[PDB]
Unconditional design. Structure first.
Ligand SMILES: O=C(O)CNC(=O)C(=O)O
Ligand code: NI
Ligand SMILES: [Zn+2]
Lengths: 349, 8
């Protein structure tokens, strides 16, 4: 009966708790964290992934995107236009310039209103999807380059690399840069570490009301829905929290600060924006709980070469009793979004 | 074959 409100939880592990990543994810799930779709973990003070960020101004952002937003009344579509390569130095100059910098504000609620008031104006540049990592090679705790989860079975058995999914991405943000409503590819988990800069704000719908958000999205954008079941996977759809309130979709809000991790959980819809110049690192990962989510993930079919993982390896290894049934197409398992991952048993005994 | 922030 854990986290019955399904609110976003924040955790403050000691360095001892922190060390084993998979095991801490099982712990937070034993506390009900997954029910929110999104959780915050504040790493211990003594922890640091990089001694300094003084040297990265020469790093290349090979395909920055200008974010053109169209819409009104809490409903928008974002078009992401690939601009020419620029350096982090070139990006920071634009980010902090009078034209693109963060407006003056008092309370977060004020910055949030300005975001929803102004997101269709003066399209910003998001330095998104940059292959690479800012962790130093020796960093053994919560290293996004090597978290050591069962997602590693993809590369271990097939040799398949999916950039961003089983490798890390860097994201350089400026004010009013946005991520649209979405779950992860194959409904995996994600991890996001805010290396530096101004905050990133998040909205999250609980996985248990996820279908409700899809039904509503389908109604607001019926053309997009009629031509692709999984159109939210296109990552173009922005919906304000006032609209979510108006139609009864439970959601939570959270602001991530420099030095904080966010975890997103399978089928946890999330969206948000950056406050100003910052840098985040992200990848996906898995637990045993994810396997059923992966078997049932509704995928985008209308775009070529979208992210699709063979589940075969995972069903054979962790669900050998159900493999023949699954392969016949007769595995009718119903997901219970409240249940924690099997690995949490250690913490519930 | 790769993760993307979003399309057009
Ligand atoms: O930071 C962004 O642009 C959005 N991040 C995520 O969606 C994530 O980490 O799952
Ligand atoms: Ni995400
Ligand atoms: Zn599609």
């Amino acid at each position: 009966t854990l986290n019955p409100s399904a609110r976003i939880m924040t955790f403050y592990p000691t360095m001892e708790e922190f060390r084993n990543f998979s095991r801490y994810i099982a712990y937070i799930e034993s506390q009900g964290a997954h029910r929110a779709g999104l959780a915050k973990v504040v790493p211990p003070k003594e922890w640091k992934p990089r001694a300094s960020y003084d040297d990265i101004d020469d790093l290349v952002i090979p395909a920055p995107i200008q974010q053109l937003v169209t819409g009104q009344s809490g409903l928008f579509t974002q078009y992401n236009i690939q601009k020419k390569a620029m350096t982090v130095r070139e990006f920071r100059k634009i980010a902090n310039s009078d034209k693109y910098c963060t407006p003056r504000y008092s309370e977060f609620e004020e910055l949030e209103r300005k975001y929803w008031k102004n997101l269709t104006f003066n399209p910003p540049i998001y330095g998104a999807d940059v292959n690479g990592t800012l962790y130093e090679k020796h960093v053994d705790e919560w290293n996004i380059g090597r978290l050591r989860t069962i997602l590693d079975l993809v590369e271990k058995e097939s040799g398949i690399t999916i950039e961003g999914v089983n490798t890390p991405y860097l994201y350089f943000g400026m004010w009013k840069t946005s991520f649209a409503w979405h779950t992860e590819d194959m409904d995996l988990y994600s991890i996001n570490y805010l290396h530096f800069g101004e905050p990133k704000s998040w909205y999250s719908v609980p996985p248990e009301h996820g279908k409700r958000l899809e039904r509503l999205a389908k109604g607001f954008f019926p053309g997009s829905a009629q031509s692709c079941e999984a159109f939210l996977r296109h990552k173009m759809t922005l919906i304000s929290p006032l609209m979510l309130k108006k139609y009864g979709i439970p959601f939570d809000k959270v602001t991530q600060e420099a030095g904080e991790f966010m975890i997103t959980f399978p089928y946890g819809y999330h969206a948000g924006f950056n406050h100003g110049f910052n840098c985040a690192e992200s990848t996906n990962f898995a637990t045993r709980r994810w396997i059923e989510y992966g078997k049932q993930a509704v995928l985008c079919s209308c775009r070529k070469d979208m992210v699709k993982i063979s589940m075969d390896v995972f069903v054979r290894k962790f669900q050998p009793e159900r493999y023949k049934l699954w392969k016949a197409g007769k595995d009718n398992t119903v997901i219970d979004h409240t249940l924690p991952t099997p690995e949490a048993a250690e913490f519930l005994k | 074959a790769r993760k993307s922030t979003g399309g057009k």
